[PDB]
Design a protein around this nucleic acid. Sequence first.
DNA 1: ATACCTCTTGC
DNA 2: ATACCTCTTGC
DNA 3: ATACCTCTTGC
DNA 4: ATACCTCTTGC
Lengths: 559, 48
Amino acid sequence: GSGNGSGGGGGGGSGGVGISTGTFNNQTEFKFLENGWVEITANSSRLVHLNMPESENYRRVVVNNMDKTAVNGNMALDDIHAQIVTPWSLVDANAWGVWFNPGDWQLIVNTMSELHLVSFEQEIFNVVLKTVSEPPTKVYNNDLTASLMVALDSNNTMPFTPAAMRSETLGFYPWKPTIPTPWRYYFQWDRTLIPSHTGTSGTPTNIYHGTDPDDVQFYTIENSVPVHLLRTGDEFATGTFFFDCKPCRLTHTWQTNRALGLPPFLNSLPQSEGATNFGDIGVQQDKRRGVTQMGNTNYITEATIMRPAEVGYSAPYYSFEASTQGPFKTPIAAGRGGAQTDENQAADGNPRYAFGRQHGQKTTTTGETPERFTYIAHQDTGRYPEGDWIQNINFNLPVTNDNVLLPTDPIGGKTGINYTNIFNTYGPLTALNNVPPVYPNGQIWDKEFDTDLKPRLHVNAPFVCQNNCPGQLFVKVAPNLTNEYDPDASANMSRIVTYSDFWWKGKLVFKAKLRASHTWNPIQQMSINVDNQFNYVPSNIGGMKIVYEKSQLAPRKLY
Amino acid sequence: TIENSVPVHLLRTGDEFATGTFFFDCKPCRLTHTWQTNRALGLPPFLN
DNA sequence: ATACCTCTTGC
DNA sequence: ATACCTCTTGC
DNA sequence: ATACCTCTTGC
DNA sequence: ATACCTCTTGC
Ligand SMILES: [Mg+2]
Ligand SMILES: [Mg+2]
Ligand SMILES: [Mg+2]
Ligand SMILES: [Mg+2]
């Protein structure tokens, strides 16, 4: 029935028991420079809460949903894999929402034309630790001398696990607390699994072989980073980090192979208004001057005519490939979009995000179903397979069935397939763009692969750091023991129930550039209205939510 | 033909020949291998 | 005594 | 008197 | 350590 | 007071 004793505070220049060590700031600054450059500084802070780990051990676990895949035709459902599980927790902040609110986004997006990522740093403070002790009256006392541990993997020794890919970054609301996630990482494993269908006879091999001892790697924080111990008075801070990576644009393109170059001169123009009064080239298709890449005909049509190269490309879908560890969907860059979609035509390439209350779902809404959406980029660089086709070289037309392959004809005798599903047109002439950011649920920057050769882009984030990326930040509560402890014993050790709270504050800097009017007509711009109006404000209860928004609004020539 | 394109040296027993030293311009080669496949990239799922 | 099919990675 | 959709490859 | 809804009554 | 799996983007 004691308060513990209240203990007394000694005082240095950067801290003590009853001395704050930090300052809260989650404010965003725009600073206009000469020539239309802007320096955007975004501050962000949060109160973070964290419990002691389940157990102070590292574990090696295997996951096995064999049963589900055992089904036949449920290949895609495979979740098998191995992983190391640590006692540490990770503080990840890589995600649009952590840093900006809508108002901000708006601005950026409407007035700028390109954006560069500059630097970033973070710090922790006002640390606090309390212990629970318990008729179920729970009491809480500060444990003045206990500690919080912190480690920053600046060397990037640990494997990299961006958490946004699972919606586990921090929260997006400055005024409400949040937490870090428990850290874990992939551990190697061999695995086989033969695809099958409903109609498939017997049991296609489906097994977990084990682990290529060659491929083994087991890391630990303890052995690789220096751990800091903070007490309340303590505080920690990373330096400032600078990024090396390309800029990101905020404009989208729209021309496709069809709109490149000099359109054909029309010998004949309409003479009155009306949406049926077309113009006419006025020349026999087989009599026109110009250039093609087709040696046989004399036809020259908007679809035949030569273009300098090729925007976009086509690839297989839905493709699953498989290697040593099981199958996985083959990614695309492009996505699709347009008039012939409307989220329902929604296909391959468009990404889809799913998430919780901490990241956008309405706070007050009950029921644990995740909120979702499919981002549909503005950039018209994807494909409409249905429109594709292939024909015989003789090119005698109108064309015969025997000389043409359609998205309609079935391949391999399977009805619901056609060449477009296994087609691929990437090649030296291909040209395209990087994905666009996705607010607020998009990852912001990402690490590059350590392969000898490399992707030309990643699909999860727009900024890929060329060199090293900022090291991960882990934390964890220091074990607080009871008076009984026998390491020699097999049992798990008992600890005092302990937990901690601390504030975290970060600063992320971008640099961008104002855009300027070039066309006569105005352009698209994000804006509020009666329809969405409520998405941007709390409910009479404090309901909040963050809807997704687009990014590359304005157009730009492609050529 | 060699004859038309290089200079030929004639050595007798007493003779001897030597090339200069040549320096390479090319990437390094690593001696480590990777093992993760698309399946092992990133944050594994949290196990409840 | 090796430099991107000559002389000439010289001068 | 042409520089990456302005002024402005200026200053 | 308060200046006209940011940074910044700073520099 | 984060640099490309150590010390060490130090010296
Ligand atoms: Mg260091
Ligand atoms: Mg190092
Ligand atoms: Mg082996
Ligand atoms: Mg292997």
